[PDB]
Write an enzyme that holds these catalytic residues in place. Structure first.
Site, mmCIF file in Angstrom:
data_model
loop_
_atom_site.group_PDB
_atom_site.id
_atom_site.type_symbol
_atom_site.label_atom_id
_atom_site.label_comp_id
_atom_site.label_asym_id
_atom_site.label_seq_id
_atom_site.Cartn_x
_atom_site.Cartn_y
_atom_site.Cartn_z
ATOM 1 N N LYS C 154 0.834 -1.190 0.000
ATOM 2 C CA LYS C 154 0.000 0.000 0.000
ATOM 3 C C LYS C 154 0.877 1.251 0.000
ATOM 4 O O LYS C 154 1.981 1.230 0.552
ATOM 5 C CB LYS C 154 -0.954 0.012 1.208
ATOM 6 C CG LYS C 154 -2.098 -1.013 1.149
ATOM 7 C CD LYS C 154 -2.865 -1.033 -0.193
ATOM 8 C CE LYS C 154 -4.169 -0.251 -0.142
ATOM 9 N NZ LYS C 154 -5.315 -1.154 0.171
ATOM 10 N N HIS C 273 -7.551 -14.253 -5.325
ATOM 11 C CA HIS C 273 -8.229 -13.210 -4.580
ATOM 12 C C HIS C 273 -9.724 -13.254 -4.930
ATOM 13 O O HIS C 273 -10.070 -13.579 -6.055
ATOM 14 C CB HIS C 273 -7.620 -11.844 -4.902
ATOM 15 C CG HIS C 273 -8.103 -10.752 -4.022
ATOM 16 N ND1 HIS C 273 -9.160 -9.934 -4.359
ATOM 17 C CD2 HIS C 273 -7.690 -10.348 -2.797
ATOM 18 C CE1 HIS C 273 -9.374 -9.072 -3.382
ATOM 19 N NE2 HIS C 273 -8.494 -9.302 -2.424
HETATM 20 MG MG LIG Z 1 -6.705 -5.541 -1.255
#
Ligand SMILES: [Mg+2]
Ligand SMILES: [Mg+2]
Ligand SMILES: [Mg+2]
Ligand SMILES: [Mg+2]
EC number: 4.1.1.39
Lengths: 439, 122, 439, 441, 159
Positions: C154, C273
């Protein structure tokens, strides 16, 4: 007439063009402007019944504004708007065909020059753009905070491939980031391209291993056919070298766009040379200004582009260098920016300055272009009295001295000669370069 | 603010971020194998880490295998037997790494690996 | 009616479905159940003569059992059996088309949820399943006896590819097994995928060489087309890296199955995912429970799958984690297991826990999932006051302390805080992490 | 908080989303909307130093408008703006991952529904869109001035490939334009796909030669893998037939875009079925409204898309709204028709909407009136259930449709005169009369 | 000449249990055999590709083992990697990966795979420098009884 629509509000999807129009005597600006609009769009000499099968208004180019040119009593800027639907997605070829394909031969005009294009985001987003662009290139090469430095090998023709690669190794080892193939060097009797690629690769890897810094040679992939162009890029890819070159105006936009895609897919940087541009972009009254050719290159794709010498007009250069590098460029008539240009995050292109420059130019060049530029020598390295590696070292030292001085807050425009003189005290290579070239 | 070291702390997977395990602590980990009905075995090596020399395609690495010390200790009920063999390796190969591994004959795989001895000087 | 057959004995080749049915007022469970059966099979509004050219009974879905739902006076579980011949071999796509393609829009129902599927061995054996699965993955990575550890980089969007790879190297070097591409990170203007793959590979290999342990980065191959998805996997293959990623619900099952096959053929691990799952799996009255989507993934193929945070209902999670990992799972209504499920040696999938977890969660996570799991941080590494490498080291230390304590026979549910506190005494990195996040 | 920005002016390049937000008790609407914006973009549970390496403001979703919902309590419409730079060009997959990938699971929401998306021209121009679209399709098939007609072959499974193709030939020869593979029909033990393709091709060409009109059968290319899907489209191409089919939600968007490109490249029409749509688009409080799935299909690529049954299903104005979103170039904001954002497609072709499910000749006036000409009316039991068989059943439907179109064109009101129009045609069409006695209105 | 082995019989070992092991545990046993002085290790005839040991996994770990044992001893090592498969396409995919790994020898069950497939594989091995180890599974169905069938010397000439 019906193609002069001065009340038209441009749409955010229109392609806009600014034409410098020189009508024949007796031809007012308004029908000259309207003729440009109709002739570069839907205008035809006799009526036709198929027009009634569609709505022609939707495909009309419109002249929506006319202004006089300073210092001229018979020249006007005419602004023309073209609908988005006229244009094939991803094709610079079709954009030029549609806008400049026909109108430059119109008899009611004495001369015509395309000065600028507003490329809307809806259209530019259909193009790849630079294979990498400025930021990615600096990250890949691990090079920050200064202009990049290059040298074009000379004589362009004469050398064996091996002697050519020797000169490349000596330039690179002395502190240049790159060496380059002359625009004329493609594949010729005494230096076939594949031989040149092998010896230049040996040179790139020898100089990189010696200095510890990443090195490249702009290997020219320009060729007679698409198949040959790509064969050349494929071998560069095999050799694992970082950058190739293309002459985009003489090779042409269809080929350039193909090569830009290949370079994106294979991680190669693409150095663009602008051979033949002055056939088109030199005369103020006729042709296309280089800023048009520069925008087109950014769309078709390249990571570097030759952008002059600035040693033309400062303000015009600064203008199209912004159009090449920046994300958003506001209209600015003093700098030849006729339209606000928004690139919606398409990467920028590194401008390359070349042509007769030596160490004494370093302060001015650094000041004009700033860090995101390539300073390309060719005479200024191979003309050093101690040879190529010292000539390279002299240029690298001069540049780093200018960058250090600038970062310290010193004014390069006023103090450049002193900055260079102070560096000569501890750099014998620079001192030697400074006595041959004088100013 | 401390900086994570860049040298001298190469690792051996599970439990190698802990301080080196004492004899007492090692015994407890071997007891865990025995209680789980897993078979202990020793491996050793003069090279401690993974590398890529002979191939570099996905999932290929060299240095994953070490050399087996004797045979898996089938039916071992006494952790001290395992720790004793660790001393035997150390004796025959003073500058070898030694790890304890464990075989699960029920899911049919190796299921444990942890470092028992690292030569100091390394 | 004729589609409610409460005396039917299910065949060992039938696909069975457990539907949570909420009929409109006035609609008894039996014709609701029969409508589900007929509408998800052979039911049609008017009679047709072509029915007499075959034996429709052989292709009828049948509702064979109905039970009330606890706490509800207008909700039932209806069990439906579908013949093996309805289904295309190897196609999750066709299995969902056939079972959930039409019935969720039926007007006599207020709401409908698919809770579970019994995938018979005859059908699951027509699928590849995971490219590798749990055991092969541990052997390839040489990682045993503990959960695996990862971190999602991130900000997801913001960074240059190079700055992105920098963060990956620092996480990996501190003791994480993996770093991951955010689900949104595919290829975008400021970080094109091929650039990201090059810098993440540099990072993987730097961290592996530094630590001596095998490292990976889940490189996201999710794309707009099959051709682009595979181009991305092909480059990962060239780079020799161990693992790639796919968003299987937004990319879709046809694409996922293609990618799973490519990964089997080329030795790549496949991290899955589950972006968009809560659009389908959140509401108790309508949609599909995640355990259905989880079984479908195991069939289509993946080596890891995101499985929650468990920081939903414990028992339901434990339920579908068994369905993902184990060879044979007995019916167990307390754990949401509506059918006994036999995978006849299809490899299992490693569940991945992510979402707002830090060192203090390590005892609970280790206790819930055991060793065959990936604990995926994303905030809990990049939020450490000393940066990424110490944040990684803090998580690796906390985990190994929990594993050591558990193996010694200590109870992680009761002693976790003490276990962590004892490790803080000798690990300054863990101590620092423990004062920022509090519990 | 920082993700609620009610004074934000949306950019012409932004992707806009309209969410129906149901917050948990005690969660204010502004926090919910801010959370929807933060959780569908940049929202991270702790601060990370890497945020300082960039400018996150540039990548933030912003909630810029919130309003209450009349019919309810504790439901708000929240508008979220996403910057263009978040999205991979040409990828519906990435668009959904980015916007709906995570936020539907947020604890502070009881429920969340995505109602509409404003797709800006700058993003939609990066997509091929339909392989052909409405106008090219009419031109290729030489069909003008009426809805197209089709029939789904039933039973979906049961038949041999040959008996299947027989039923197709008899439907097509009676006057239907198309026949279709049921969504479940892919390749299965008693009817393998390549066998089905051969016999359906024989039937297409037989019926075409007999009637003089161009015919098609939607050959289902939906498959377990991309390679299988394309193998099936490639054999359709070899046979020279006009149209193939895909189930875009169950096959998925990455596969659908691949197929759309293949169909553009090889001149094949692409019929899109929407199997599984009601898993996510049925409930008013949670999921995604079909108009979102419909816009996504227009972008990914299809020439037809199943769009409902709108008769005796759902609400008329809502159907009319997303049919405009599918077909038109420019659709003005209109909340009465569920159009939350003005939508400009900048000359991307439109998709023909397909009505199916339980329709017969007496529905023809209402179907023609609601959808107008640019539609496919897709029967099943309404052709295969005619007492005289498939070809008279097809004829009855074609007659009924042409009588409706004739009367409409003359200026008659289909909404009020439909039954009279049908009964008049029964006087000269024995096929329609027999149909009208079996079904009723 | 290729293996640089002269003046003695060559020595091999077939890994057992044929079925049971993970690919990794299988390769472990190969490394230990090879390092002790055998020239080769071999895939059991039954070992092709099966649920608990898929062929490509086995090829990777056996390659690691071959190269570890060769580096340890200084002598050239090999493992007869079984390419026997259900189809020609799969058989050749297996040989192609062995080729990529640079290992010296592959294996085929020539009677159960059959002569058309065997001849195809023999050609691939000539073109790519791979040795070909042939196993004779099923021969005694044909060659055992003195009164009926074919003597193994016929099957041997044919090979
Ligand atoms: Mg994510
Ligand atoms: Mg030159
Ligand atoms: Mg159907
Ligand atoms: Mg044997």
């Amino acid at each position: 007439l019906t193609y002069y629509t001065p009340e038209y509000e441009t749409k955010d999807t229109d392609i806009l063009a600014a034409f410098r129009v020189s009508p024949q005597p007796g031809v007012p600006p308004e029908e000259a402007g309207a003729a440009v609009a109709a002739e570069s769009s839907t205008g035809t000499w006799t009526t036709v019944w198929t027009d009634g099968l569609t709505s022609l208004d939707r495909y009309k180019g419109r002249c929506y504004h006319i202004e006089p040119v300073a210092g001229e009593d018979s020249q006007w800027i005419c602004y023309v708007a073209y609908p988005l639907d006229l244009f094939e997605e991803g094709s610079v070829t079709n954009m030029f065909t549609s806008i400049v394909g026909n109108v430059f031969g119109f008899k009611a005009l004495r001369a015509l020059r395309l000065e600028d294009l507003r490329i809307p985001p809806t259209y530019s987003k259909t193009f790849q753009g630079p294979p990498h662009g400025i930021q990615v290139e600096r990250d890949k090469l691990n090079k920050y905070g200064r202009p990049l430095l290059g040298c074009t090998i000379k004589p362009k023709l004469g050398l064996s491939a091996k002697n050519y690669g020797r000169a490349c190794y000596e330039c690179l080892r002395g502190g240049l980031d790159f060496t380059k193939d002359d625009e004329n060097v493609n594949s010729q009797p005494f230096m076939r391209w594949r031989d040149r690629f092998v010896f230049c690769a040996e040179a790139i890897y020898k100089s990189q291993a010696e200095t510890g810094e990443i090195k490249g040679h702009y290997l020219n992939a320009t060729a007679g056919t698409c198949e040959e162009m790509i064969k050349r890029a494929v071998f560069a890819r095999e050799l694992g070298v970082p950058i190739v070159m293309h002459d985009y105006l003489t090779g042409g936009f269809t080929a350039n766009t193909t090569l830009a895609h290949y370079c994106r897919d294979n991680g190669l940087l693409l150095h663009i040379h602008r051979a033949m541009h002055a056939v088109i972009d030199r005369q103020k009254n006729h042709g296309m200004h280089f800023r048009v050719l520069a925008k087109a290159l950014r769309m078709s794709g390249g990571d570097h582009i030759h952008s002059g010498t600035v040693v033309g007009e400062r303000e015009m250069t600064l203008g199209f260098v912004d159009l090449l590098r920046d994300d958003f460029i506001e209209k600015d008539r003093a700098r030849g920016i006729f339209f606000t240009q928004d690139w919606v995050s398409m990467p920028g292109v590194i401008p390359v300055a070349s042509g007769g420059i030596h160490v004494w130019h370093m302060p001015a060049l650094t000041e004009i272009f700033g860090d995101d530029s390539v300073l390309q020598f060719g005479g200024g390295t191979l003309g050093h009295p101690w040879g190529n590696a010292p000539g390279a070292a002299a240029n690298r030292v001069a540049l780093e001295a200018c960058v250090q001085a600038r970062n310290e807050g010193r004014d390069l425009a006023r103090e450049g000669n002193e900055i260079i003189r102070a560096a000569c005290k501890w750099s014998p290579e620079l001192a030697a370069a400074c006595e041959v070239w004088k100013a | 603010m401390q900086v994570w070291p860049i040298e001298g702390i190469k690792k051996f997977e599970t439990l190698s971020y802990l301080p080196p395990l004492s004899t007492e602590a090692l015994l407890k980990q071997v007891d865990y194998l025995i209680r789980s009905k897993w078979v202990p075995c020793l491996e050793f090596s003069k090279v401690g880490f993974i590398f890529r020399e002979h191939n570099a395609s996905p999932g290929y690495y060299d240095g994953r295998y070490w050399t087996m010390w004797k045979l898996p200790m089938f039916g071992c009920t006494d952790a001290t037997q395992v720790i004793n063999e660790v001393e035997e390796v150390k004796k025959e190969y003073p500058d070898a790494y030694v790890r304890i591994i464990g075989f699960d004959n029920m899911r049919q795989v190796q299921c444990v690996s942890f470092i028992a001895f690292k030569p100091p000087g390394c």
